[PDB]
Amino acid sequence: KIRTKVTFHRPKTLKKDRNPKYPRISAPGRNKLDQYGILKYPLTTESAMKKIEDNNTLVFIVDIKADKKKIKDAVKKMYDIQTKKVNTLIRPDGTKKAYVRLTPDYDALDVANKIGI
Amino acid sequence: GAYTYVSELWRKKQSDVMRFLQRVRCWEYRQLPSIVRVTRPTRPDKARRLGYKAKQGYVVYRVRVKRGGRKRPVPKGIVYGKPTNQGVTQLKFQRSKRSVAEERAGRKLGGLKVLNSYWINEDSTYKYYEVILVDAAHAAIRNDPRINWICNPVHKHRELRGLTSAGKKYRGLRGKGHLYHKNRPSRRGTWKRNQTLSLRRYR
Amino acid sequence: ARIKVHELRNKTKTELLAQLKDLKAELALLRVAKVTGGAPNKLSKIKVVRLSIAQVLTVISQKQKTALREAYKNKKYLPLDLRPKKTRAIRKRLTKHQVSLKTEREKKKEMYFPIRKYAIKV
Amino acid sequence: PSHKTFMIKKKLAKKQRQNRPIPYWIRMRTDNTIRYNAKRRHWRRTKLGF
Amino acid sequence: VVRIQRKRRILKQRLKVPPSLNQFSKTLDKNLATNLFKMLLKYRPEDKAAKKERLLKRAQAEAEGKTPETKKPIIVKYGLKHITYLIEQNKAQLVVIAHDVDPIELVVWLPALCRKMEIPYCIVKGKARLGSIVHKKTASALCLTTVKNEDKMEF
RNA sequence: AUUCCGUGAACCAUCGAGUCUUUGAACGCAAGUUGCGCCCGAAGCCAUUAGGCCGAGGGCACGUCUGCCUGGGCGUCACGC
RNA sequence: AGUCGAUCCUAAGGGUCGGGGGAACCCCGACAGAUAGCGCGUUUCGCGCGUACUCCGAAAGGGAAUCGGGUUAAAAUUCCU
RNA sequence: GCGACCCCAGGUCAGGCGGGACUACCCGCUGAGUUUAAGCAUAUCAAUAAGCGGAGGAAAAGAAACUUACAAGGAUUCCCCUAGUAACGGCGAGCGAACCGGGAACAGCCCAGCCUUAGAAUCGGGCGGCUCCGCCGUUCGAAUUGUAGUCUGGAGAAGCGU
Ligand SMILES: [K+]
Ligand SMILES: [K+]
Ligand SMILES: [K+]
Ligand SMILES: [K+]
Ligand SMILES: [K+]
Ligand SMILES: [K+]
Ligand SMILES: [K+]
Ligand SMILES: [K+]
Ligand SMILES: [Mg+2]
Ligand SMILES: [Mg+2]
Ligand SMILES: [Mg+2]
Ligand SMILES: [Mg+2]
Ligand SMILES: [Mg+2]
Ligand SMILES: [Mg+2]
Ligand SMILES: [Mg+2]
Ligand SMILES: [Mg+2]
């Protein structure tokens, strides 16, 4: 054997991927954050109604754990409407609120009428 | 028929052969960490007589401990008290060095049970013991009737409760009679029993 | 119109999932009614729908767990969630056979000189 | 301050929710002993001490 | 590990070795060792497969052949206990001791015992080689108690 | 709500089935941060012995025991060159 | 709020592996040591480099990117154009 | 260059174990002073409080390297007595057991070493079966630097009879 480096380096040895005999968890967990759990209920305040009328935007109360991507996906699944952009904030009461602006192809007033506000 | 030969040779500790071997071994141990597993015992006969068996689940760890007394660990060697307690040096730990070694092994290896230990080597600075430990979770141990008692919960941390051979030695349980009666069932238990003031219903 | 657990137990997984989806949609509609100022009759249905959702979920979970237990029956190395819980110390305990293990001399002593049945009268 | 951590904000939200009078119908319950909310807090009287 | 195993050899070389340990540095010559070991290769103990085959043959033939007599096997003996017992009982005819037994207190007295019992002994290189002889990872020592008629002269 | 002569009310009792959020000995790294990483992967989109997007969900701490795989050192030897 | 900040970097320092002490709670802190890994081509294996912490530590230090105009009872370089 | 062994290294390798929590009792360590002595330093407070660890339903102890000096008792533990005694103590203040005797309960045992060598008879894992806290078959591995079996001083090995 010929060594050109004075420093000794640990040789590379094979590693094996885990192949457990039994699964630690019997079955995959349930999807807690589904679309129904993501979308709690729409907001029916005066400001929300003004947003719907003017900016073609819906106002929703959403699970605090939900992100903008999940909110967009849940809105699409629930109401079959595209979203131009989702803005989010956490109210002082601790709940998450989302302003979801629909694309021009969709009418916020018609969507709200279908929802039932 | 060889263990007797080995035992007598190890009894002859001042012989040239033993001195050479112990010198080499002490040098080698000085270069390694304080606690280190050994593949097999270096005193097979002593391990046998202390309860080691050459089967799966038995392990041996070499433990190195510092020599000397116990200096009172007070800052600047200052004692706030009476002259009788003002002493700092020349104070002695109530436990033995082998007990310290077993405690270190047991604390380090929380998943095993310390069965026993024995002296192997020493220099002016260090004393060396080998501790025999048992993996109570192994099927061989659990199915061996002579040792599976160690798996019962009452034997947890024997070394830390002083239940090993060294534990009994330093607790004063290796003798019986007028010279040792105060240590049974324990020194503190005897003190409590003796100090108890019994006030019966009918006095 | 009320949900019966014994009736749910006779349904399949797909039917139970469809019923769960319908109940979730109804619960969402009831929440919308509540936030828009629904009448007390609509408001009272929230408890019923939530109970129905919980019942359906429980039936699904019990069926799945029974299936998993049957699949893992007569097998070693079960999943931890399916292994018996008991307590930590009880789980660590030695088995009855291991407790009863003894040496050959002890077995011979028990076989040769057991405690005899005797009386003192004559 | 305007800069606040998420955990502190959530704790403040909980405190705000807890700071309210008791429902009126609580006083009409059979064998009721609650007269008012004994744990009411005012931002100027007692500080949260966070 | 490398540094310490090299320094151990250096220290053993530097320090004076008492004669009892020094006697283990003089092993059997190459030619003599090769002859002895080629002799030993034909007295190896049966392996697990051979033992199982012989046991099943004996079980099959027990009732049918009415337990026919079988010649006593002639094989090398191993295991420190058994070797020491044979030496003490004067049944051993040749003793072979590995030169690299660790701890060496196990066999440091064996040459003295063999000399006292008038049993010829040799110190050879390789407990691993002895173990290979006896189908084991290592063997502290081996012993021959008897040899075959065709091999008595060379023995 | 309840065939209230009944698979049946209950802010009833009891327990075997099941669910059980963020943490905490707390375990990928941290923390006055819902901050910063890596790995596997159901279903779906078009993509066809080819790979892409997404992601349900789950993994990656330390010390140890048994067994195993992959390796290092003339540390002890042997066979060849 | 992709554009304002945290988030990223490191400062004084803090917290650590191994090692050394310690009855032990713990103490020193990369100092007693087979480091993390990083590039090239690929039958995913080979080749070449590889000085023992790729951790915390700044809403005033360093630093990727937004501007008008308009709009609310209360928000905006975040909402509308 | 190959092979055997030794020691060690890396594995999110297959399967296991450990950490922490509670306080009345229990086990180990460490450890004061207030106070008493009409002052005070040895002593006392106290082998205590505080501090650091480790268990269970009890823990610990336990089958004599004992007590005794007798016409002898016979593991350990606890109660009564011994006894405020022997002893210790600026022999000051104070401190202070044990044996016998009477009761509660009672239980004895397992190893190491010389002793298969006509073959490790021992044990663990995987796989396949079964009346599945275990048994059987097969295959790998551990182990001769010793797993099983016999033996533990009260004995015991070997031999001969019942
Ligand atoms: K004093
Ligand atoms: K950070
Ligand atoms: K240490
Ligand atoms: K360090
Ligand atoms: K900054
Ligand atoms: K603008
Ligand atoms: K087997
Ligand atoms: K034995
Ligand atoms: Mg290096
Ligand atoms: Mg003091
Ligand atoms: Mg360390
Ligand atoms: Mg960084
Ligand atoms: Mg006990
Ligand atoms: Mg009296
Ligand atoms: Mg008595
Ligand atoms: Mg098996």
TrEMBL record, chain B:
<keyword id="KW-0689">Ribosomal protein</keyword>
<dbReference type="Pfam" id="PF00827">
    <property type="entry name" value="Ribosomal_L15e"/>
</dbReference>
<dbReference type="InterPro" id="IPR020925">
    <property type="entry name" value="Ribosomal_eL15_CS"/>
</dbReference>
<feature type="binding site">
    <location>
        <position position="80"/>
    </location>
    <ligand>
        <name>Mg(2+)</name>
    </ligand>
</feature>
<dbReference type="GO" id="GO:0003729">
    <property type="term" value="F:mRNA binding"/>
</dbReference>
<dbReference type="InterPro" id="IPR024794">
    <property type="entry name" value="Rbsml_eL15_core_dom_sf"/>
</dbReference>
<dbReference type="GO" id="GO:0022625">
    <property type="term" value="C:cytosolic large ribosomal subunit"/>
</dbReference>
<keyword id="KW-0479">Metal-binding</keyword>
<dbReference type="GO" id="GO:0002181">
    <property type="term" value="P:cytoplasmic translation"/>
</dbReference>
<dbReference type="GO" id="GO:0003723">
    <property type="term" value="F:RNA binding"/>
</dbReference>
<protein>
    <recommendedName>
        <fullName>Ribosomal protein L15</fullName>
    </recommendedName>
</protein>
<dbReference type="InterPro" id="IPR012678">
    <property type="entry name" value="Ribosomal_uL23/eL15/eS24_sf"/>
</dbReference>
UniProtKB/TrEMBL annotation, chain C:
<dbReference type="GO" id="GO:0003735">
    <property type="term" value="F:structural constituent of ribosome"/>
</dbReference>
<dbReference type="GO" id="GO:0000463">
    <property type="term" value="P:maturation of LSU-rRNA from tricistronic rRNA transcript (SSU-rRNA, 5.8S rRNA, LSU-rRNA)"/>
</dbReference>
<dbReference type="GO" id="GO:0022625">
    <property type="term" value="C:cytosolic large ribosomal subunit"/>
</dbReference>
<comment type="similarity">
    <text>Belongs to the universal ribosomal protein uL29 family.</text>
</comment>
<keyword id="KW-0687">Ribonucleoprotein</keyword>
<keyword id="KW-0689">Ribosomal protein</keyword>
<dbReference type="InterPro" id="IPR001854">
    <property type="entry name" value="Ribosomal_uL29"/>
</dbReference>
<dbReference type="GO" id="GO:0006412">
    <property type="term" value="P:translation"/>
</dbReference>
<dbReference type="Pfam" id="PF00831">
    <property type="entry name" value="Ribosomal_L29"/>
</dbReference>
<dbReference type="InterPro" id="IPR036049">
    <property type="entry name" value="Ribosomal_uL29_sf"/>
</dbReference>
<protein>
    <submittedName>
        <fullName>60S ribosomal protein L35-like</fullName>
    </submittedName>
</protein>
<dbReference type="InterPro" id="IPR045059">
    <property type="entry name" value="Ribosomal_uL29_euk"/>
</dbReference>
Automatic annotation (TrEMBL), chain D:
<protein>
    <submittedName>
        <fullName>60S ribosomal protein L39-3</fullName>
    </submittedName>
</protein>
<comment type="similarity">
    <text>Belongs to the eukaryotic ribosomal protein eL39 family.</text>
</comment>
<keyword id="KW-0689">Ribosomal protein</keyword>
<dbReference type="InterPro" id="IPR020083">
    <property type="entry name" value="Ribosomal_eL39_CS"/>
</dbReference>
<dbReference type="GO" id="GO:0003735">
    <property type="term" value="F:structural constituent of ribosome"/>
</dbReference>
<dbReference type="InterPro" id="IPR000077">
    <property type="entry name" value="Ribosomal_eL39"/>
</dbReference>
<dbReference type="GO" id="GO:0006412">
    <property type="term" value="P:translation"/>
</dbReference>
<keyword id="KW-0687">Ribonucleoprotein</keyword>
<dbReference type="Pfam" id="PF00832">
    <property type="entry name" value="Ribosomal_L39"/>
</dbReference>
<dbReference type="InterPro" id="IPR023626">
    <property type="entry name" value="Ribosomal_eL39_dom_sf"/>
</dbReference>
<dbReference type="GO" id="GO:0022625">
    <property type="term" value="C:cytosolic large ribosomal subunit"/>
</dbReference>
UniProtKB/TrEMBL annotation, chain E:
<comment type="similarity">
    <text>Belongs to the eukaryotic ribosomal protein eL8 family.</text>
</comment>
<keyword id="KW-0689">Ribosomal protein</keyword>
<keyword id="KW-0687">Ribonucleoprotein</keyword>
<comment type="function">
    <text>Component of the ribosome.</text>
</comment>
<dbReference type="GO" id="GO:0000470">
    <property type="term" value="P:maturation of LSU-rRNA"/>
</dbReference>
<feature type="domain" description="Ribosomal protein eL8/eL30/eS12/Gadd45">
    <location>
        <begin position="63"/>
        <end position="153"/>
    </location>
</feature>
<dbReference type="GO" id="GO:0003723">
    <property type="term" value="F:RNA binding"/>
</dbReference>
<dbReference type="GO" id="GO:0022625">
    <property type="term" value="C:cytosolic large ribosomal subunit"/>
</dbReference>
<protein>
    <recommendedName>
        <fullName>60S ribosomal protein L7a</fullName>
    </recommendedName>
</protein>
